[PDB]
Amino acid sequence: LIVNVINGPNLGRLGRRGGTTHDELVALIEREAAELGLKAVVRQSDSEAQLLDWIHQAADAAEPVILNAGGLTHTSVALRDACAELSAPLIEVHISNVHAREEFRRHSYLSPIATGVIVGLGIQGYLLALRYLAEH
């Protein structure tokens, strides 16, 4: 079973002003996925249109999605509407605790339609979302 891990704007800057980089995150995820018997496809883009295309492809293939949409979490109705079409689980992930920062970060257009949300557990949040999905 294939799981899409989709990272949104500014996530390619991970580790570069907390040192895990985006390439390292990809390697960590693929290794964990292989241990669980899953195939993880990890993609990152700063373009909202590109993220919508990837979600549409996950919706047509009925594949689960682990999404960290970055700043678009708080602002894009178009992203929420694309994610409303998914039929497999959608897990929203944030690396840092979004509730401990500015007040505008406490509102997400994605949380109400996600199956679950994991915030503040660092990069381990992606690995735990994978384990939830492997345990069906």
- Which residues participate in catalysis according to the annotation? 94
Q: What is the DSSP string of 45-85?
A: -S-HHHHHHHHHHHHHHT--EEEE-TTHHHH-HHHHHHHTT
Residue 81 marked as a ligand binder: yes
Choose, by CB under 8 A, the member of 13, 31, 39, 43 that binds its own copies: 13
Comparison of 42 and 82: residue with beta carbon closer to its own copies: 82
* Binding-residue total with its own copies (CB under 8 A): 54
For 21, what's the count of Cα atoms within 13 Å in the CB-facing half-sphere? 3
Task: For the beta carbon of residue 41, count every other beta carbon within 10 angstroms.
Answer: 16
**Binder among 10, 18, 24, 39 for its own copies (CB under 8 A):** 10
Burial of 47 (0-12, 13-18, 19+ CB in 10 A): exposed
Of residues 31 and 56, the one with the C-beta less far from its own copies: 56
Could you say whether residue 49 binds its own copies (CB under 8 A)?
yes
Residues numbered 58-87 forming contacts with its own copies, rule: CB under 8 A: 60, 70-72, 74-82, 85
Cβ atoms within 10 Å of 87's Cβ, excluding its own: 12
Site for its own copies in 85-124 (CB under 8 A): 85, 91, 97, 99-100, 104-105, 108-109, 111-121, 124
Instruction: Give the CA dihedral 102, 92, 36, 39, nearest 10 degrees.
Output: -120
| Rama region for 88: left / alpha / beta (φ>0; ψ in -120 to 50; rest) | beta
Residues at the annotated binding site for substrate? 68, 74, 81, 95-96, 105
What is the contact surface with its own copies in residues (CB under 8 A)?
A: 8-10, 13, 16-17, 45-50, 52-53, 56, 60, 70-72, 74-82, 85, 91, 97, 99-100, 104-105, 108-109, 111-121, 124-125, 128, 131-132, 135
